[PDB]
Amino acid sequence: MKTRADLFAFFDAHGVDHKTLDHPPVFRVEEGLEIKAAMPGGHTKNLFLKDAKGQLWLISALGETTIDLKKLHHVIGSGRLSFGPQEMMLETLGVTPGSVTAFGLINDTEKRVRFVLDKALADSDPVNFHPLKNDATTAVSQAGLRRFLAALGVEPMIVDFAAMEVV
């Protein structure tokens, strides 16, 4: 529901530094080399999940982190995890499949989505996410990411995915 301009206006009001590279959507490793070279820091995958108890989850991780979904419920204290329905992704994050992003939390006005943050991503600086669509990548400092989450009242559950521990 919120546009990219709404997101950047929210960033500016809350001190979230942002630098955006517009680019064609990336599917091949060949074109990925170019975005990673142009945008230092952590690059991400973002999974919209729904658990067997009905809770919606968003996991943001480094692209190279393996999320063992089938065993993650024992770590985060959820029901067994599945991918969340596309309609709820739109309703709660304002994005479509392929454009999932932690920045979609700006759309979760009723706080339906619990946020899980990869510890290796929490330690990265800067970090990179889609600005609500996969035809751009936006870099924010780690401090900016924390300002963004704090402004939304989102406290991340920080997960070491190698040790499968909340840290």
| 3-state SS, residue 79 | coil
Category of 42 on φ-ψ map: left (φ > 0), alpha (ψ -120 to 50) or beta: beta
Residue 37 CA, distance from chain mean position: 20
Domains of the chain, residue spans: 1-167
Cited resolution, angstroms? 1.7
In the structure encoding, which two tokens stand for residue 101, read together?
């992003």
Q: What method was applied to determine this entry?
A: X-ray
Handedness of CA 89, 90, 94, 96 (dihedral sign): positive
User: What CA–CA distance (Å, rounded) separates 105 from 162?
Assistant: 25
In the structure encoding, which two tokens stand for residue 28, read together?
């091949």
3-state helix, strand, coil in the chain (%, to 5): 35, 25, 40
Q: Residue type at 39?
A: M
Partners of 138 in the beta sheet? 20, 129
The DSSP code for 129 is: E
Classified by CATH at the fold level, domain 1-167 comes out as: YbaK protein (3.90.960)
Sole residue written with tokens 């001190």: 15
First vs last C-alpha separation in the chain: 33
